[PDB]
Design a protein around this nucleic acid. Structure first.
Lengths: 50, 49, 150, 49, 50, 100
DNA sequence: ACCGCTGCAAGGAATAGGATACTTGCGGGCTAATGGCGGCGAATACCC
DNA sequence: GGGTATTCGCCGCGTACCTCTCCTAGCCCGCAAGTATCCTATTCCTTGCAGCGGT
RNA sequence: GGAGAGGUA
């Protein structure tokens, strides 16, 4: 959602505001067990201890 | 988005014509110019430097 | 501080941006950055009378900093202009880099030239080679070997 | 997409399953690794860790 | 010529693409992959099994 | 030998016209220019007169290389501010006279 | 009364605007490291 | 100046085999210049007729 | 051809 402040008015006012469903990224989904299927292979992220 | 792809080229060859003009230059002989000492010196005099 | 160094000398500044769609915004972006400079706009796509007005008013010192495209590359007079600020020297041909370095100068006054760079790892490797070449050679007689760098 | 695919594809942690059991799957899904980004080094860890 | 014989002996080392510096006539002699340690290191041999 | 001058803009032609005219201020030589800034009625006499040839020095932009300019005896090409002009515009004049 | 002079109709003429196709450059998008030890030069700072 | 301890960064970091996955690069179209034509339309400049002046 | 993960001895 984009806000545009109208220049003529003082600091912080609304000319108009638009909105649309932007798409960004293809996040992998975990399966029902634990596996992330990445390239037809079946990877697993291990928990890191730091 | 209307900036995608797909324009062709090579509507007219250059290489043959460049070779032609270069061969034509290297075939004929250039002009042997004539130089005048004092006439060129009077032109040098017009140079105020 | 580059703009201030030029204006309290008294001459004028070529500030070149080379994108006409946003040069209007870049004008005020520079203008509240230096509130005491006088900024007008000039580029090759105006109505071919306001351009001449801008350049002649520039020629009569009516304002200090000119935001411009590479229209100035046509090699105008007014040696009082003594500082080039190329805002994005990433995308500019090295021969006309030398040409724009020739634009300032023309005077006994010591001209200046700041070539703004983006962050060094962001840019093209070829741009880095270009900028190392232009940072190596700052003399007279160095135009030709700079073409051997081209 | 580049940032998430680089991590899910090529990291020190997103590793290939041993699938030659049910046991080897279910104990490779609980490995507590002390390596990878922000961690210590395979060759450069003392006798204390 | 100073880049030919040993590129990178200078602080400035000229490269090609992707900022990897070129191999010089030092680099086929320098280090752990030169012509000096390779004969001394393991060379795979014919007529063998495992 | 009908010197021909080529520059890649109108402005450089404009300074060159001053330079040529002011330096050749004492010799029987007629020097002119052509660009888009010249009117057609001036173009139609300048380029026609080039065939006649009392103009010996002619300055201009790409307007010279417009496949209509006919120098009666071309003897010298001078071209300024080189790194423009492609290749075709560079040798399109030499196509007229092989040993220019 | 009738050329003499003026104001307006027109017509062409010239010129801005906005197309097109040509050159230089060059990039942008796009397909095609802060969990270690040791030696040594640098760089000391340090007492003489 | 000048011997002398001292520290700090730069760079080396130690067998053989097997398995699996990740890797970047040139160019077409865009941008900015610049130049030419080509209609068009659109105002501008110039001319010629309509109509009143007058002494 | 390289980097990374594992596994054996």
């Amino acid at each position: 959602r984009l806000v545009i402040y109208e220049r003529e008015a003082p600091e912080g006012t609304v000319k108009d505001i638009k909105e649309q469903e932007v798409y960004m990224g293809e996040i992998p989904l975990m399966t029902d067990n634990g596996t992330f299927v990445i390239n037809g292979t079946e990877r697993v992220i291990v928990s890191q201890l730091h | 988005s209307r900036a995608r792809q797909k324009a062709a080229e090579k509507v007219r060859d250059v290489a043959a014509e460049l070779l032609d003009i270069y061969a034509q230059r290297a075939a004929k002989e250039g002009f042997a110019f004539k130089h005048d000492r004092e006439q060129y010196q009077l032109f040098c005099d017009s140079f105020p430097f | 501080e580059a703009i201030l160094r030029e204006i309290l000398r008294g001459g004028q500044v070529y500030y070149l941006y080379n994108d006409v769609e946003n040069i209007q915004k870049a004008a005020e972006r520079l203008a509240e950055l230096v509130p005491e400079a006088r900024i007008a706009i000039g580029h090759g796509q105006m109505r071919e009378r306001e351009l001449e007005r801008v350049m002649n008013d520039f020629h009569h010192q009516r304002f200090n900093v000119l935001v411009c495209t590479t229209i100035i590359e046509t090699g105008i007079d007014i040696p009082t202009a003594n500082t080039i600020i190329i805002e994005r020297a990433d995308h500019f041909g090295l021969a006309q880099l030398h040409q724009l370095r020739g634009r300032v100068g023309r005077s006994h006054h010591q001209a200046y030239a700041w070539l703004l760079t983006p962050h060094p790892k962001a840019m093209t490797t070829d741009a880095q080679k270009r900028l190392e070449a232009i940072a190596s050679l700052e003399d007279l007689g160095a135009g030709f070997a700079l073409a051997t760098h081209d | 997409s580049a940032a998430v695919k680089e991590f899910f594809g090529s990291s020190q942690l997103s590793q290939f399953m041993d699938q030659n059991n049910p046991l080897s799957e279910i104990t490779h899904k609980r490995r507590i690794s002390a390596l990878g980004p922000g961690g210590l080094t395979r060759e450069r860890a003392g006798f204390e860790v | 010529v100073d880049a030919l014989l040993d590129n990178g002996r200078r602080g400035r080392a000229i490269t090609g693409s992707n900022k990897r510096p070129l191999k010089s006539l030092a680099d086929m002699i320098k280090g752990k992959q030169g012509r000096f340690r390779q004969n001394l290191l393991g060379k795979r041999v014919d007529y063998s099994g495992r | 030998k009908q010197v021909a001058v080529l520059v890649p803009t109108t402005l450089l032609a404009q300074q060159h016209y001053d330079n040529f005219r002011d330096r050749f201020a004492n010799w029987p030589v007629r020097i002119e220019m052509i660009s888009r800034f010249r009117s057609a009625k001036e173009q139609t006499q300048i380029l026609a007169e080039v065939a006649e040839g009392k103009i010996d020095i002619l300055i201009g932009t790409h307007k010279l290389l417009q496949s209509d300019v006919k120098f009666k005896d071309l003897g010298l090409l001078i071209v300024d501010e080189e790194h423009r002009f492609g290749v075709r515009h560079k040798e399109r004049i030499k196509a007229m006279r092989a040993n220019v």
